[PDB]
Amino acid sequence: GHSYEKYNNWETIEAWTKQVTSENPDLISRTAIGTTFLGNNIYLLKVGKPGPNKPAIFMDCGFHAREWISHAFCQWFVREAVLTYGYESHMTEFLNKLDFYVLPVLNIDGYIYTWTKNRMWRKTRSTNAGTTCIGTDPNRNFDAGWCTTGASTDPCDETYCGSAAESEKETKALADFIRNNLSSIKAYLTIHSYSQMILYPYSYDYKLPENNAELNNLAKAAVKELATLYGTKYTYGPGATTIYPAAGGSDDWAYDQGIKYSFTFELRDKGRYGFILPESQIQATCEETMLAIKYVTNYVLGHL
Template identity: 25%
Template sequence: MAALSRVTAALLFSVTATAAAQVLTLTEDSYGDTLVPLGYPVPLPVDSQTPVDGFRRYAALQARLDELALSSDSIREQTIGQTLAQRPITAVQLSDADALTAEGFAEPAALINGGIHAREWGSPEVVAALVEHYAERQNDGGLYRYLLDNLNLIVIPVLNVDGFLQTQRYPDTFLQTEYSGDPTPADLSAEPAEYRNYPRDGRFRRKNMRNVDETLCAAGSTGCVADGMLGVDLNRNNTHAFASGNQNSNASGSLVYHGVSAASEPEIQALYAAGNLGPAARLRLYVDTHTFSRVYYGVNTGRTRRDALARALAQRMSAATGGVDRYPYNPTPAGQGIGSTDERFAYDYQIPAYTLELEPSANGGSDYGSFGYHHDGFVLPASEIARVREEITAANTVGLYRMAGPPSLIAAQVRRVDSDLLVYDARWMRDGSTRALTQFGDGNLEPGVAYRLWLAFNKPMRWRDPQTQAITQFIGQSIDLAPQIALTGRDAGGAAFSFALATTAEGWRATPPGTSAGCLRYADDAYQVVFTLPTGSPAIEARRLQLAVTATDFTGQALDTNPATVADWAGGWANYEDDAGRADTDVGGSDRTLVLVDDGSSAAAGGSGGGGSVGLGSSLTLLLAAWLRRQRAQKSRGKPRLQ
């Protein structure tokens, strides 16, 4: 740090006569005029590609991402822009090769950004951890394979590359200005008063870098440290509410300087380019990761449904970190703003968009026993980051899984247990932008005969503990682990009835597709139950017999009651019907679309019995496929069923 100390005199001269500046050094417990004791070891950048109890150097972090991209077809790096120093800004894209879901519909997208403020070292670690988590689990056959196949996730671990490198050059040293007397320096006249004694550079640099001369930016140089008075706050440089509110400034030296115009900075242009990889029209979630305060900041855009869903999603994600209010949701009222990135994505695309402030809480480093320096919240102890990585990875997983789309019941089979004879087969299949239902079999059930009912959904519905392989709650979630299934309809005399089947959580299928009692595509996207109807059951010789299925995914999202109209996002869920058939309530309900015996009467016991129509060519193809499927089942009893 001696080289940095030599520039102090030059800095004092370069600011103005009415502002003083000094270089201070962070320590664990040493006191002095220029020493700031934290009360815990000062984190220093670590030259390790793999995660450690600490913060990785930028080069090591980037090398790790390069390695993961080279070793996986589902992880790709994209250069989305350049800094003023001509350093590449890199996004990591996590998805399969096409832009379609497993069913063939247009894939949704999400964008998670990190490192927009240089001093917030927890952000790149947490965002990179999500990439690492995906990479380790990409072949799990379940949740993460589903997300890779059905969601285009774009991740930017470090947006403000130049600024981040500056903080790592001086990991325990920083520049602080102190103001006294009037007038204040001309270039800082509009600095909000609360920021006037805040640290400006070194470990506590916030903004991007304006001085791009590589010789000046050598370690310990005068130019780079003096540049702490310049730069733009990238989280004030956005197209919505640019130069608005009381948390930004038109003074170039301000910590919250918004820049000369909206999106003037190459980093913000790169962020928007990353969104276009979605493409932007398919975005459903945006998270900008910061430190500190332990809160989900957001905005209310004035669209009631979007605003309610954004709040509910934040609470679900917070719960995955240890409680609904552990990361409370704090939205800005509609019409207000400061030029932040979450405002831009929320208003332009009407999606849930957040500024996620990592821990510590607003108490700062005192959460970990610090001595109380007012900026120590930006210096998370190295011993805490591994836990924070895990917690926020779980929170992001909840958000991505939920915004990938609501669950739909898309297939069912009924077979005799004794012979494996296929009694009923139904499947919703893509037909253009909708699904069409094909059903085969007479569906008549006999008393005293054991039947195997198999149901399949369009996404993994449950979380399975990796160690015990038991179905359990995902972190912080609370749902019914077993679905509710009933046979409903009208008996031989025309009276309505409902016969509930006994279900347990053990019925979820983790066996690979193509095997007996297997899943459809992903572990736990299918459920199986064996049932027997007693003599005298109203389901025997029923005029109308249909399935009534109530289930949620592992975040509590209920079924789309009409799979024919595929759920999508339009500032709220579109084509996501509830029990009354309404598509604008965002709540879903129970599926009653699969009819084993149909006398042409209306659905009994409430709910929708609707389905989609199929064109003639598609209908013949589907019916032929179903007929062949049944013939093979009857001739090859005991073989794995075709799915």
């Protein structure tokens, strides 16, 4: 069965996407935006009160297989939305005015692999010509200074950038969806762990986004809000200098598509447990993260 305070396997998450949609048809619609290399369905939940030409915020989880708290957060977010709509003024306003496009798990094949074989797997699970080595790093696989830095051209490496940008079915599917909905998508949020950071562009170069001052102010406010709940300390800044240079990331790509608010979130913790964050921290992690995501949403709505 599904639990919001446990890590759920794909079969359970999949069944959950069907159930939560079935139970909340006036707030959620479910679509598939493609298949993974191994034929799993890439679900996308449109969360919001339906209406004509609404703006949207896009959020994905589960880019990286081992970052289990990421997957947990997208599920937590959806429950919070449906439970508090009509009762909490901000979320009610949010869902009335815009849609959240929530992609609960992008790298499903890798996620399944962390459940069945290797808890520390990162990449996709696609085959590579000429080698037995498996998988591409999905966050090195986007058309953003592709493979020029912080990436490997070797399929045996953890940051393999792929044979070409969007060579992976999963990243192609995500990019296709965002490109098809650029007129509506006002912010892109991609959830990772760990490090307790909010990053904005750029990572593929040391150059700064034109609205750099705005993004720094937004991230600064978001981390302050997050800390109010349990005192959790986040840092923030442009990817390249705040964590490390790395090309081919979806946050940079999305920004260069014209989505002016693009953030990579790195959730708890700081390395005590690392990727193996205890289930006992799921609820607190998700609760404080909700505050930061809602703050960003409120800001974006006031700047349409």
